[PDB]
Write a structure and sequence with these properties.
Chain G: It is found in: Cytoplasm. Chain G: It comes from Escherichia coli (strain K12). The structure is cut from a larger assembly and holds 5 copies of chain A (about 100 residues) and 2 copies of chain B. With about 100 residues, chain A is an all-beta fold. Chain A has one domain: GroES chaperonin (10 Kd Chaperonin, Protein Cpn10, Chain O, Roll). Helices cover about 0% and strands about 40% of the residues of chain A. With about 180 residues, chain B is of the alpha/beta class. The chains are: A mainly beta (about 100), B alpha/beta (about 180).
Chain lengths: ~100, ~180, ~100, ~100, ~100, ~100, ~90
């Protein structure tokens, strides 16, 4: 099973942290570092603000995105794997082609 | 002259450049026992400040990694963050690198650093001068045949440097 | 004597916290964590904002939802049972299967 | 691969910090400071707020701009370089001609 | 090379600092005070809040103004001299003649 | 050189502090207190905060007014005299007749 | 509780004594048992370790003041090798 986001919420999973290639040939072990990249697991119904209609999200399920790991980023236990929950606003950019 | 272990007198002679500083990473032993580090045709790095999360300076390390040669590091201190990745890197074979603390006291260690660098042909990274942690090419680093390191001592078999530089360093010592 | 939410509020109840089944068959002790899982006990009148109508809530009564516990979520006792009160906005996901 | 920011977000990169041109002929080294000017690498779709229309960004791609480096500025690695991500509101002015 | 401010941003220059003339004939030294007077070098497009095309700034280019120096005002130097960047809200008054 | 207020900004001057009439006949010395009354020297264009048009201020030049000496109240030197600058919102009342 | 129910029969005993003292004695314990010491410091993480990493012993004896391992299963080439570095 999986979750269905409650409007304006996007469910994403974080990509690998401190990927072995920092500064060059140097391989670096992960200590106190984190990654802002992720995948879009699910898309909410849309934003419900200003009452009129529901605006669709600009992110497609399965997209690769860049987001701000901020206050609005929530940690959820689904099945048994780490997921991130944030609004469309928290996702800064999309890695496309 | 020192007190001997036996009933007999014994003489010890030291060749080349050697100092009483040990290795920060006990874990990296290049080949022999006693924690000995033997780096062949290593590049020597000298700095005037410590390394922690300040690991960034990696392009310097990578250039050496690209080279495929061992790296010797002299600075006031090295912390576990750099050492942690470094121990893995040396064990896994990416780079054979060990770091040792610079001499003793403020003026004493940095005054001593220029001769080590000049002797090996390298350039001391002067924080003090228009130089920075990642600002410095691999060519800046000094060279030596090999080094020997143990828990309390660091030795360089022979740095590669010219006589005019060796003698000039000795000549400036006359004052 | 059950409860009906007061506009833009949803009454839900929390599911078990650190249930002893994580990862496998090994009992994971309670290490001071709480469950974000819940069921929607009641649905409020709706959003009264913008004076334009009074829009009904997306979440129907009896739904299974995922939400982030926060200041917005309030603790109330109804007939000596624990329930949670939060707005539609505070719910982050719907579990449908 | 480049990047594509998602609405209102602008991707810019910073100009050299304390370039050796301060005071005139004096070569000034950088000991602890930063640069206020950057280039707009990418333009988001526009602001999603107030449903009726999406407001396009005032800044075109490749623009040399002046911006307020604040909390709302994000740093990520694109093509092994750091880029700044901020909203349209964050960028104060454009150098023109 | 000169600068064009982005909507609602005004670029001004301060006149002079604690010039010795205050209080009368007497020349008063500067012990920690800064002038509040400025000249407007450039005018932004105008504020874009609430869709509505682009409402114009009340202050004309070359306008002599009085402003409140808060953290809103940002400092950069152009043509190797100090200039100020602030919104219309920061400027409190205009000196006409 | 007199002052020209700019939109929704009103320039007023403070009245004398702790005037010699407290407790009736008795005179109380001036020590650590400040007046809340002022006179309106200048009137701004008006509030521009709502789509179209500019709304007029309800205060006219020469009025005696009551105001909230808050964050939005500023002090300026005109011809070596103290003048206060604040929005109409900061002015609590008008002294009439 | 995990042990009392029967989910796992597991417990721990503190390392020999002090940083350099305990860390130094960890390598021999691991090699003797055929296991690998989790090097937080080098290239390992608390979660990161597989079951094979753990060493094996016939049985252990534990009391309020002492911990004993009757026989870890490891090869002599490794036992002697640990012993060989000991000669210095």
């Amino acid at each position: 099973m999986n979750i269905r986001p409650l409007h304006d919420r996007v469910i994403v999973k974080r990509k690998e942290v401190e990927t072995k290639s920092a500064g060059g040939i140097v391989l670096t072990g992960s200590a106190a570092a984190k990654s802002t990249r992720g995948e879009v697991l699910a898309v909410g119904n849309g934003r419900i603000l200003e009452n009129g209609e529901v605006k669709p999200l600009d992110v497609k399920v399965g997209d690769i995105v860049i987001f701000n790991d901020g206050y609005g980023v929530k940690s959820e236990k689904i099945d048994n794997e780490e997921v991130l929950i944030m609004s469309e606003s928290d996702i800064l950019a999309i890695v496309e082609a | 002259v020192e007190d001997g272990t036996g009933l007999q007198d014994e003489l010890d002679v030291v060749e080349g450049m050697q100092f009483d500083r040990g290795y920060l990473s006990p874990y990296f032993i290049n080949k022999p026992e006693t924690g000995a580090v033997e780096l062949e045709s290593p590049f020597i790095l000298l700095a005037d400040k410590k390394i922690s999360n300040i690991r960034e300076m990696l392009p310097v390390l990578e250039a050496v990694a690209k080279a495929g040669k061992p790296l010797l590091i002299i600075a006031e201190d090295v912390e576990g963050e750099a050492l942690a990745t470094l121990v893995v890197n040396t064990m896994r074979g990416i780079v054979k690198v060990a770091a040792v603390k610079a001499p003793g006291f403020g003026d004493r260690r940095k005054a001593m650093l220029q001769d080590i660098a000049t002797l090996t042909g390298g350039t001391v990274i002067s924080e003090e001068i228009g130089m920075e942690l990642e600002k410095a090419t691999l060519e800046d680093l000094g060279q030596a045949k090999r080094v020997v390191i143990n828990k309390d001592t660091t030795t360089i078999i022979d740095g590669v440097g010219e006589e005019a530089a060796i003698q000039g360093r000795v000549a400036q010592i006359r004052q």
